[PDB]
Structure formats: C-alpha cells, structure tokens
C-alpha cells in the first residue's frame with residue numbers, strides 16, 4: 001500500500017522505489033530542465049537509490065552544466081539547479097577584484113556621467129519624471145443634452 | 149455588429165477563392181460547426197488579406 | 198503573453214492558461230507544484246463575471262449553464278486580468294453564437 | 303514578448319556568473335526566472351538561511367542589479383506586516399553594468415600608462431615614495447646617492463620596471479574575456495527598453511510556492527500624494543446566415559418599414575377633404591405523386607460568495 005515500494009508482477013517482487021528515478025547525467029539534466037520553478041532538488045534524496053552522486057555532480061559542475069550549492073563545513077553538493085546561462089567560470093579572479101573595487105556613483109547623477117563619456121545612458125534622472133428656473137413639473141424628464 | 153450571409157454568397161466565395169474552400173472542407177464538420185468557421189474566418193487575417 | 202498568466206484558484210497559486218488549439222477551447226489551471234489541476238470546458242460557460250476596475254479586488258468568475266457550476270479565479274496584475282478577460286470574451290461570445298444558431302435551427 | 307528582453311537577461315546572466323560568486327547566481331537566477339519575489343519565498347527556493355541571504359542581497363542591491371519594494375500588507379487573519387519584494391530594473395542594471403565595464407577597462411589603461419613612466423624611488427626606512435623630480439632635490443652634496451628627508455638615508459629604486467608587458471597581457475585577456483558584454487550592450491543600445499516597476503513586473507509573475515503568505519498584488523493607497531525616492535518610473539462580431547425563407551422575411555420587414563416611412567409625411571384627412579358639411583368637434587396530388595413515383599420506379603426497373611460583479 002505504500003508509495004515508496006514498487007511491485008513486479010512478472011516475478012512477484014517488491015522494489016525500493018525512489019523519489020527521483022535518475023541513474024545517469026542525462027536523466028538528471030533533463031529532470032532539472034523539466035522543473036517549472038527554481039526549487040532545487042535535494043541532493044540528500046538524490047543520493048538515495050544512486051551509489052555515486054558527488055562524482056557525477058562534480059563533473060557536471062566542471063562542465064558548467066548545472067548549478068550546485070555546496071556546504072560550508074566542507075565541499076559537499078546540496079540542492080542543485082539547471083544552468084540556463086553560459087560557462088559558470090569565465091572571469092579571472094584578478095578582474096573580479098577590479099569589479100569589486102569599482103564603486104558606482106549616485107544613481108541620480110549616473111546617467112549624466114555616461115553622456116559625458118559618450119556612452120548612451122539607458123536611464124533618466126528621477127527628478128525629471130513629472131507626476132500626471134420654471135416648469136418644475138418635469139422633475140427628471142429633462143435630459144442634459146448640453147453638447148449635441 | 150451583424151453581417152448577413154446567404155448560401156448563394158457562400159458558394160460564390162468558394163468559387164472565387166479556393167483557399168477558403170480548402171480550409172472549409174477539411175475542417176467542417178470535423179472539429180466544430182459551420183457558423184463558427186465563418187465567424188472565425190471573418191475575424192482572421194486571411195479574410196482581410 | 199495573452200494566453201497565460203498567474204492566477205489564484207481556491208486559495209492556491211498557479212498558472213492559468215487558455216488552450217484554443219484543441220476544439221472546444223478549454224480553460225486549464227495548474228498549480229505550481231502540479232499537485233492540483235483544474236480544467237473547464239468553455240462551451241459550458243454561460244456568463245463571464247468580472248470585478249469592477251474601481252475595486253481593489255481582482256476576481257474573475259465563470260458560471261456554467263445548467264445548482265449551476267461556478268468557477269472563480271483571482272489574478273495579480275490588472276493588465277494580466279484584462280488581457281485574459283479580453284481573450285475569454287471572444288471565446289464565450291462565439292460559443293454563445295453557436296448555441297443560438299444550434300437552437301434556432 | 304520581445305527579443306530584447308532575452309538579450310538583457312543573457313547579459314545579466316553572464317555578468318552574475320562571471321563577476322560574482324556562486325550563491326549570487328542562485329539568487330539572481332531565481333529572481334530572473336520569476337518576477338517580483340518575496341523574501342520568504344526566495345529563502346525557501348534556495349534553502350539558504352536569512353543570514354546567508356543578507357550578503358547576497360546587499361551586494362546585488364549595491365550594484366543595482368536588483369531593486370527593492372516595500373509595501374504595507376493587511377492579511378485578513380493576521381496583523382499588518384511590511385513585506386519586501388525583489389525584482390530587476392533593466393535600465394538600472396544596464397546603466398550600472400555599462401559604467402562598471404568602462405571603469406575597469408579605463409583603470410587598466412590608466413594603470414598600463416602609469417607603468418610606462420619611470421619607476422621612481424622609495425626610502426626603505428620610512429617607506430615614503432619619491433618621484434624623480436622630488437628625489438633630485440634631496441641628493442647629497444657629493445651628488446652620488448639620493449638622501450631621504452625624514453631618515454637621511456640612501457634611497458632604493460622602485461619596482462614595476464619589468465611589468466610593461468605584464469599589464470599589456472592583463473588588458474589583452476580582459477578585453478577578450480569581456481567580449482560578450484560589449485556585444486550584448488551594442489544590441490541593447492540599438493533597441494529601446496521600457497523601465498520596469500513592481501506593478502509591471504507582476505505581469506510576468508510565476509508563483510514560487512503553492513500557498514505563499516506574501517500577497518503578490520500591488521494595491522496602491524487611494525489618492526495618495528506621497529512620493530518615495532526611486533519609486534516612480536517613466537468589439538464583438540456576430541454573423542447570421544440568411545436563407546430563402548429568411549430573405550423573404552427580411553423583404554417583408556423592409557416593406558413594412560417603407561410603408562411606415564411614408565406615413566410621417568402623409569397628409570391627414572382633415573387636410574385631404576374639405577370638411578364643412580360634417581358635425582362639430584368636441585365631447586389528391588399526393589396520391590398522384592406516389593403512383594407516378596411507383597410508375598417511374600417501374601420505368602427505371604423496366605429500363606434497367608457574494609461580491610459586486612458586472613456582466614461582461
């Protein structure tokens with residue numbers, strides 16, 4: 001009667017049904033794609049019913065095929081998501097630091113600064129937005145046809 | 149807004165246009181009824197073209 | 198962006214879609230997790246009730262022709278609600294025309 | 303929708319995946335997959351604690367890749383609480399990305415230009431840097447070695463003399479690596495993007511959860527003159543088929559209309575006849591057909607919930 005057990009009438013056998021029936025990187029990749037929401041699939045449940053998951057997940061991470069959330073105590077895969085973007089690692093650490101160093105100016109002044117440098121600004125200053133009698137025996141017969 | 153149609157006009161449309169007949173014979177009656185087809189046809193861009 | 202959108206059915210958030218390819222056109226609503234699915238055949242709908250634009254509430258209800266069946270839906274954005282309403286207006290109007298012709302003949 | 307929206311999304315996806323860590327991709331991707339997303343829903347989508355979510359949201363907000371919107375909510379069953387929603391304002395993110403890309407490229411170019419200038423000098427003791435002009439006036443009487451002011455000690459030549467090529471390599475790599483961003487921006491400039499708003503973003507909403515507590519609705523307070531910073535941004539056709547019986551019926555209706563039409567101009571009876579002599583005013587074939595059909599048949603055989611609502 002339980003749902004986590006599968007019956008085999010051919011031999012009359014009970015099998016340990018798993019939440020997700022994935023035993024190959026191809027199956028996992030399509031399962032993540034089929035998700036209608038961004039709720040990652042738990043790796044705790046993924047490991048059950050599948051001998052190795054860390055090895056396969058690590059290879060996909062190197063290939064940039066999926067996004068993996070890893071613990072902080074030690075590198076261990078947790079809830080994963082399908083990678084809809086490009087290569088996960090494409091920027092050298094020396095340039096990430098430079099990006100961190102750069103500080104954006106005040107937003108109200110940023111569009112003006114870009115125009116000074118010749119770059120078209122895709123924004124506007126918020127300050128520029130502007131908010132934007134006789135015969136009373138006919139009590140109600142007379143309809144107001146004032147204009148035509 | 150109402151538009152009046154007659155069988156003689158219906159035959160004329162098929163004779164003067166084979167595309168309309170092509171989409172009529174293979175659809176009416178299989179999926180829905182004739183009156184919806186003509187209302188569907190008029191609202192479509194095919195009638196405008 | 199004129200046949201799909203977010204809607205709340207029976208206090209359950211989900212996606213509401215209009216399927217016109219399959220005749221007759223039917224209104225299908227599915228929960229985000231897929232646990233609950235509701236399908237309504239538009240041919241059975243008699244009237245389309247919608248809340249006034251002057252009220253903060255944004256419900257849209259379809260009533261089926263005969264204890265008549267009643268289906269109520271709630272939306273999030275007025276533009277989405279209006280877009281669905283305009284499309285649904287065309288479907289209900291045509292099916293009403295077919296019913297008049299069918300009974301008339 | 304529009305092709306440009308995908309281009310903007312792709313630009314954001316590349317920027318977050320390259321210039322930010324791992325958890326940043328998860329947060330922004332979730333807010334890109336869905337429209338305005340409640341903070342509570344975002345936590346459970348990624349299953350990351352509030353403390354861990356803080357650094358990610360804060361940094362993304364600082365770079366203006368994500369916008370915030372706080373509105374008062376009044377649950378029918380609980381006391382009112384302020385809710386926070388996160389979405390993406392494409393003009394803001396594109397504006398921020400464009401400036402940062404220029405700054406990083408400009409900084410390397412300026413740094414590359416700086417490295418081409420003479421090295422300079424420094425004092426090992428006080429660690430005070432001296433330019434060539436400044437070091438010339440501090441040399442000793444014997445004019446053999448430069449002398450420090452604070453320390454009165456010989457100076458040491460500065461480094462960076464061999465980096466003339468290293469910085470050139472650094473600039474070469476970044477331009478090649480950052481190619482997709484410029485290409486995406488070039489297409490973005492060609493088109494025109496419409497600024498996003500909390501209400502506008504809700505049109506594309508994909509509910510995160512089944513029974514999310516946060517109400518994904520924008521009910522602005524009636525006729526409110528208050529303005530907050532950065533919270534403002536720039537028929538049926540019926541057809542009737544007329545048959546022969548209906549055609550004559552329409553003719554009868556048209557004939558009736560014509561008969562009534564003349565009446566409004568018809569002269570009255572008083573007007574017609576001079577009324578002086580009148581009083582004052584005031585105070586069987588079927589059988590024949592069957593035998594024919596039988597006879598012709600023989601010939602062929604021979605020859606052969608109460609709320610206000612309106613009806614839409």
Ligand SMILES: [Zn+2]
Pocket residue numbers: 425426427428429430450451452453454455
């Ligand atoms: Zn010194």
